[PDB]
């Protein structure tokens, strides 16, 4: 959904990054490694 | 109104009294929840 109290440029970065990393995000849907942003965190950020 | 009433008088009839209705403030309490993907906000206020 479109942001109401957020930054427009930051919001666009979330959506473009969400689309660009679709193969990795769902292949590693439940994977977590040290010193790497987990796919679960990226999915939460993209949805909001 | 007086000019209209003068020229639109029927035979044997007249307007013997003119009454103006008075305003009473009607403060309506309204709570509305929008969809999560609203685009224009000023438009909804005009529509409401």
Overall description:
This is part of a larger assembly, with two copies of chain A (48 residues). The first copy, chain A, has 48 residues and is mainly alpha-helical. In chain A, 58% of the residues lie in helices and 0% in strands. Chain A starts with 7 loop residues before the first helix and ends with a helix. At the A-B interface, loops of A face loops of B. It is classed as virus like particle. Keywords: Contractile injection system, virus like particle. The entry is titled "Cryo-EM structure of the PlPVC1 baseplate, 6-fold symmetrized (C6), in extended state".
Chain-wise SSE layout:
This is part of a larger assembly, with two copies of chain A (48 residues).
Chain A (H helix, E strand, L loop, with lengths): L7 H13 L1 H6 L11 H9 L1
Helix content of chain A: 55-70%
Number of helical regions of chain A = 3
Largest interface: A-B, 2 and 4 residues
Biggest beta-sheet profile of chain A: none
Shape of chain A: elongated
Oligomer: part of a larger assembly
Backbone CA Rg of chain A: 12 Å
Per DSSP E runs of 2 or more residues, the count of β-strands of chain A stands at 0
> Beta-sheet strand percentage of chain A?
under 5%
SSE topology string of chain A: HHH
Distance between the termini of chain A: 8 Å
């Amino acid at each position: 959904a479109r942001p109401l109290t957020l930054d427009s440029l930051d919001f666009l970065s979330t959506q473009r990054g969400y689309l660009a990393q679709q193969p990795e995000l769902t292949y590693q849907r439940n994977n977590i490694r040290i010193d790497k942003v987990s796919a679960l965190q990226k999915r939460i950020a993209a949805r909001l | 109104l007086n000019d209209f009433l003068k020229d639109n008088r029927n035979l044997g009839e007249s307007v013997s009294k003119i009454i103006w209705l008075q305003p009473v403030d009607f403060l309506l309490q309204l709570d509305i929840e929008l969809d999560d993907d609203v685009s224009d906000l000023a438009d909804i206020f005009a529509q409401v």
